[PDB]
Amino acid sequence: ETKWQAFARRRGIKPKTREQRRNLQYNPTTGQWERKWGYKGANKRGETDPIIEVSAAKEAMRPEGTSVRGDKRREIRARVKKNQKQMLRNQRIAAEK
Amino acid sequence: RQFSVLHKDRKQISVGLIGYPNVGKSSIINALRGKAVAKVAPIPGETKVWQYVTLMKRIYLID
Amino acid sequence: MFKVVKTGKKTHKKGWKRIVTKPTFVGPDFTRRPVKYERFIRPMGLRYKKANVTHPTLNVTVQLP
Amino acid sequence: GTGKKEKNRLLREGRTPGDPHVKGENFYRSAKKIKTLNILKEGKPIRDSKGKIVKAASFQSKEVPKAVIEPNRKWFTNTRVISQDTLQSFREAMAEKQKDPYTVLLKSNKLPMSLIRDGPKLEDG
Amino acid sequence: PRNARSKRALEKRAPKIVENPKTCLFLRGTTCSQITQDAMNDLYAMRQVHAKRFHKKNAIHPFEDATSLCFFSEKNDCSLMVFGSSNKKRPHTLTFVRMFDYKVLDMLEFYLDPDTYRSISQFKTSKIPIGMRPMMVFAGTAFESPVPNAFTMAKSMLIDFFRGEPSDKIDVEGLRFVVVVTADEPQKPILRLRVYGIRTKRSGTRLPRVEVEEHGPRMDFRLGRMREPDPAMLKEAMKKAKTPQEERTKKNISMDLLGDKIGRIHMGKTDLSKLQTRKMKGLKR
RNA sequence: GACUAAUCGAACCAUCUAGUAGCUGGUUACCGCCGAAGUUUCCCUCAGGAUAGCAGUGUCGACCUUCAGUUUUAUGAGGUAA
RNA sequence: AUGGCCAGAAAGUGGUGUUGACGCAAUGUGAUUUCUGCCCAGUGCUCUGAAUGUCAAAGUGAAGAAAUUCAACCAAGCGCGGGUAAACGGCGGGAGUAACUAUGACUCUCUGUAGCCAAAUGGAUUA
RNA sequence: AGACCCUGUUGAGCUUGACUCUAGUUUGACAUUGUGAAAAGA
RNA sequence: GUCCUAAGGGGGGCUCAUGGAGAACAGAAAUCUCCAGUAGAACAAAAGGGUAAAAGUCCCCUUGAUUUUGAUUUUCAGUGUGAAUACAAACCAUGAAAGUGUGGCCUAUCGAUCCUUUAGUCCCUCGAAAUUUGAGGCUAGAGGUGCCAGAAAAGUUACCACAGGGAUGGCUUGUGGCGGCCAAGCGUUCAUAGCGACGUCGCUUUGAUCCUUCGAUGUCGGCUCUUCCUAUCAUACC
Numbered sequence A: 001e002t003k004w005q006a007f008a009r010r011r012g013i014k015p016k017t018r019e020q021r022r023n024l025q026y027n028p029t030t031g032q033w034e035r036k037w038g039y040k041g042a043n044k045r046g047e048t049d050p051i052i053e054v055s056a057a058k059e060a061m062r063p064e065g066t067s068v069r070g071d072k073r074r075e076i077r078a079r080v081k082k083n084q085k086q087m088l089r090n091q092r093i094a095a096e097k
Numbered sequence B: 001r002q003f004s005v006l007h008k009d010r011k012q013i014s015v016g017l018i019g020y021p022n023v024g025k026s027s028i029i030n031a032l033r034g035k036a037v038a039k040v041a042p043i044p045g046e047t048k049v050w051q052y053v054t055l056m057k058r059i060y061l062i063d
Numbered sequence C: 001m002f003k004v005v006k007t008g009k010k011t012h013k014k015g016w017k018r019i020v021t022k023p024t025f026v027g028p029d030f031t032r033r034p035v036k037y038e039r040f041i042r043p044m045g046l047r048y049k050k051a052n053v054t055h056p057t058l059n060v061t062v063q064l065p
Numbered sequence D: 001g002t003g004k005k006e007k008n009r010l011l012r013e014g015r016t017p018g019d020p021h022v023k024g025e026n027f028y029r030s031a032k033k034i035k036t037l038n039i040l041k042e043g044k045p046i047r048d049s050k051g052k053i054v055k056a057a058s059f060q061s062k063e064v065p066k067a068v069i070e071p072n073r074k075w076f077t078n079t080r081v082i083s084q085d086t087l088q089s090f091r092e093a094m095a096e097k098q099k100d101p102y103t104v105l106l107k108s109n110k111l112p113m114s115l116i117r118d119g120p121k122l123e124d125g
Numbered sequence E: 001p002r003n004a005r006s007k008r009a010l011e012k013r014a015p016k017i018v019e020n021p022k023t024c025l026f027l028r029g030t031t032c033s034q035i036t037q038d039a040m041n042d043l044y045a046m047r048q049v050h051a052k053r054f055h056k057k058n059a060i061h062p063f064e065d066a067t068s069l070c071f072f073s074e075k076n077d078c079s080l081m082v083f084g085s086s087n088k089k090r091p092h093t094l095t096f097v098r099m100f101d102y103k104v105l106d107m108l109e110f111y112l113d114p115d116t117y118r119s120i121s122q123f124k125t126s127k128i129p130i131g132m133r134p135m136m137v138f139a140g141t142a143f144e145s146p147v148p149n150a151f152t153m154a155k156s157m158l159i160d161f162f163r164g165e166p167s168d169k170i171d172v173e174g175l176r177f178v179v180v181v182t183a184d185e186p187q188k189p190i191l192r193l194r195v196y197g198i199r200t201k202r203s204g205t206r207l208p209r210v211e212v213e214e215h216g217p218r219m220d221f222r223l224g225r226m227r228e229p230d231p232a233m234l235k236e237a238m239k240k241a242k243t244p245q246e247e248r249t250k251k252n253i254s255m256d257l258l259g260d261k262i263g264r265i266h267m268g269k270t271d272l273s274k275l276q277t278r279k280m281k282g283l284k285r
Numbered sequence F: 001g002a003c004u005a006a007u008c009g010a011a012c013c014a015u016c017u018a019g020u021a022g023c024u025g026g027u028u029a030c031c032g033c034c035g036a037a038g039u040u041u042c043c044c045u046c047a048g049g050a051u052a053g054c055a056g057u058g059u060c061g062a063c064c065u066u067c068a069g070u071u072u073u074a075u076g077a078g079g080u081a082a
Numbered sequence G: 001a002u003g004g005c006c007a008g009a010a011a012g013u014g015g016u017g018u019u020g021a022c023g024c025a026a027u028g029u030g031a032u033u034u035c036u037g038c039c040c041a042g043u044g045c046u047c048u049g050a051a052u053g054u055c056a057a058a059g060u061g062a063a064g065a066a067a068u069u070c071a072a073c074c075a076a077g078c079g080c081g082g083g084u085a086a087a088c089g090g091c092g093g094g095a096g097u098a099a100c101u102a103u104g105a106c107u108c109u110c111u112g113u114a115g116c117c118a119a120a121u122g123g124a125u126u127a
Numbered sequence H: 001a002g003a004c005c006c007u008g009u010u011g012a013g014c015u016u017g018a019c020u021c022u023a024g025u026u027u028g029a030c031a032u033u034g035u036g037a038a039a040a041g042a
Numbered sequence I: 001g002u003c004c005u006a007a008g009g010g011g012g013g014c015u016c017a018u019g020g021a022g023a024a025c026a027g028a029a030a031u032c033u034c035c036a037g038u039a040g041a042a043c044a045a046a047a048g049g050g051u052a053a054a055a056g057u058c059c060c061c062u063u064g065a066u067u068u069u070g071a072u073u074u075u076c077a078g079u080g081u082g083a084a085u086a087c088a089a090a091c092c093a094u095g096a097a098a099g100u101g102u103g104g105c106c107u108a109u110c111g112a113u114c115c116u117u118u119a120g121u122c123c124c125u126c127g128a129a130a131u132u133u134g135a136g137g138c139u140a141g142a143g144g145u146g147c148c149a150g151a152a153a154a155g156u157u158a159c160c161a162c163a164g165g166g167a168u169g170g171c172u173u174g175u176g177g178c179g180g181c182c183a184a185g186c187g188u189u190c191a192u193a194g195c196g197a198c199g200u201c202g203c204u205u206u207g208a209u210c211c212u213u214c215g216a217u218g219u220c221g222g223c224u225c226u227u228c229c230u231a232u233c234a235u236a237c238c
């Protein structure tokens, strides 16, 4: 058992259903169906949009060379790096066991 | 107990008692419990409403 | 969909129970939960087992389970 | 001994430290039991000083959801299929059937009963 | 496993509840006689579908070191190995080697009799189709010894070699070749391996009359050096996994002929002898 | 949870004590000059906050620069009618 | 009785007690009749039975120029290992065996129109 | 200005492996605590 | 900082890196042609024998982004038409076919103005002086919740009390819903589509059976007595 599996067994966390974990959601504003993640997913909404609202303070704190169009990809890379470190820790623990 | 073993997947079983008036449904429930838990009278129609009595952990009796 | 079913002998009554106000399908081998642990109430007068199904191609309406 | 405090009980039972807890946990109450007993205490909305509901009760959410159906290829396929050999075997089985009082029915098998049960008598038909 | 193809290979090589048919690796040492190479060719022809063949010379002595055999099992996913050798002490040797978990489970040497060995091509008969599993017949008193010995392990390896693929059904036209292994208790006993084709003839009875014709190859072996399995590894290899379609029998739970789940209740004998009836006023004389 | 001087799920008396309330009620002459407003922006919310904006008194500075919920000109969007 | 149950800030203090198991103190049930579904051993009750496994204060030994630091040792209770008020509680039976002790586990199958028996009665349908 | 509903930085009574304490009980050490012997050792 | 009808699967065709000889610019290095080329390229893994009419590279089709069923396996379920899971079967894609192949991979969370730790010799102070330990301040570093510490302050009051705040509508009535067809007409007549009253057609016992009553959260009454409406049971007329 990994760390998440042990924690879920202790806390009584139920596994999500296959219908609940589908990569599909209904966007009301566009009135269309879209993916939550992956190619053209909801996690990258607005990277290809023609106009993006930018906060003045956020743009001032933004480093030179970077733009608003890569912030979501930055957050995805950070989350993927954290998940990868966690799964590597789990694999190392399972290898020791 | 055998019915409870057969329905071990469920949390408990309910056993409802039916019949004519004055046949002894409440008397049977009281006898199974070993205690006067349901009202008993020789006049017909003493029991007017449905009543739950917890016989064991997984056995309920319904008068 | 859900209406509050009030229980208790006091003037202030517990309201944890809900009752489904629309028709439901309970399926086969249905035994109701006991009243102490029955939060959702699906009344027997609203349970349906058959429906009038129409085939768009054959233009035939049959009552089906 | 060790102590009747909740922390001492946690180290005595060896639960992994840092785990979250449901409010009201003790020796007599697990998280499942607290959820079960708080179900009985549910049903009261959160109101302001003027009685207006600011948070709805359980299963009284008052917000209208977007009731839509996605296009899916699964809607236009057959969910259940059965073969002629299987139908013939079921017909032979139901012809072979005999009633035993000391046996009980625990789970009904979902079968196309109209294609398995025998036809009515010709006089009635 | 980045690619789906490499992932498929890894899942195929992963342990399973029901196993894949075992793969046999045919390889030879630095010295291997032509008779031994012909015997390896005949065994490969018997087992074409689930075998791989090496073509180089390997300086490996299997009873001294088997690390290279473990490496080859790891790389080729082969659980059986036929290793050819030739020597002054042992002129023609076939070393049947069986793995478990990519480590050597057991090993057995066969010494060929060279003057009586006949290849498949030297018999002028119709041959077995590719992919057809032949039936097996084991004859003699050497296979029912109470102690596990070299003959019993040879029987096990030959069963695992000519096992083929498992099947719950078989066509009646696929019962036309038989492989017969004969060996007797006793100076060294000779294990004789023969393959025959089967002809059927009318006999005036529903059961047909079976007639045999020699198919080849004709092999005579003397059992040689012997490497028995470790005990714990032997129990780990003889553990039998349970198929998920094989249900566990529950007490008083069954399934009827219509698929309904049926429970059994038991009432017991009705004993009313110790019941005292009510002594009413009207029952007294 | 009855009684304990008409006082009891903690008697009566005096003091700390003018205890505390964000809640309720009230808050006392006249005239004149101005004079309003409800996500604008950020913060975990309800039992939330600041903050932008709108106002009044004084001043000071050359009350210096002039600017403007408007049109026109030209160029965009709307090339949409015609 | 060098005792229990209490009360008291304490006391060379008081009550039970001018008392001593047919007594004192604390409980549950509540006349009489009826009356103890079958079997245990999970929680609990109690066993000075072996351990130091947790192991404070004081004490012991070592290092430093000392402040200080590190080590064994470490009572009761807990823990471990036994018997139960078997109270709570869990437990559908009965047979075998290959396990061999707890937990087994793997199969088999289980459904008298007023009597008999008990020291007149068979009751709670209690005056 | 009753009752009922709702709100509170709400008050108060009661309960429990809720928190921090504590009466009581139990265990260890020190002083009260003196006098000799008979051994075992350093 | 950019780009993509995504990856994947199936089928078909072709052979690569390099060397030699040649071709205006083109000259070691652009593109094209021939010959030789066991892979010496590319794709994966870590061969001590991976892949050559392919496992490489280009075309065609699917792109449907995680299908259905299960009395079976494992786990769980106070929301038990079971859920997740494994396996099997069916489906699906491709191909002429043999067949091939998919129907996911993972993970507690919180702090970064945080936690832990190191060095300062030529940094400062310990306020009577000096030295050595030690402590504090300041500065500079290192790592990132395995070895970076920690993340456990519950209920009840029908025994009660206080300070306050409160207590859809010119609606309805006599004729069902869904689906198809016809349909006078409305539109349209460079598109012949779209609405459509009146209707119709399919689902919802030879006068039977009586052995199938299907859930109080929402509360009504009774007496006495007066009046009004008509949507008239009776009396009156047609």
Ligand SMILES: Nc1nc2c(ncn2[C@@H]2O[C@H](COP(=O)(O)OP(=O)(O)OP(=O)(O)O)[C@@H](O)[C@H]2O)c(=O)[nH]1
Binding pocket: B020, B021, B022, B023, B024, B025, B026, B027, B028, B039, B040, B041, B042, B043, B044, B045, B046, B047, E278, G125
């Ligand atoms: N002699 C005898 N009398 C019995 C027995 N069982 C029940 N009775 C009597 O029968 C009477 C009626 O039975 P009840 O206890 O009222 O139960 P019921 O049949 O549900 O009656 P209702 O509640 O009115 O429907 C009881 O008063 C008993 O005294 C029995 O086994 N033997």
Ligand SMILES: [Mg+2]
Binding pocket: B021, B022, B040, B041, B042, B043, B044, B045, B046, B047
């Ligand atoms: Mg009765």
Ligand SMILES: [Mg+2]
Binding pocket: B025, B026, B027, B039, B046, B047, B063
């Ligand atoms: Mg009754």
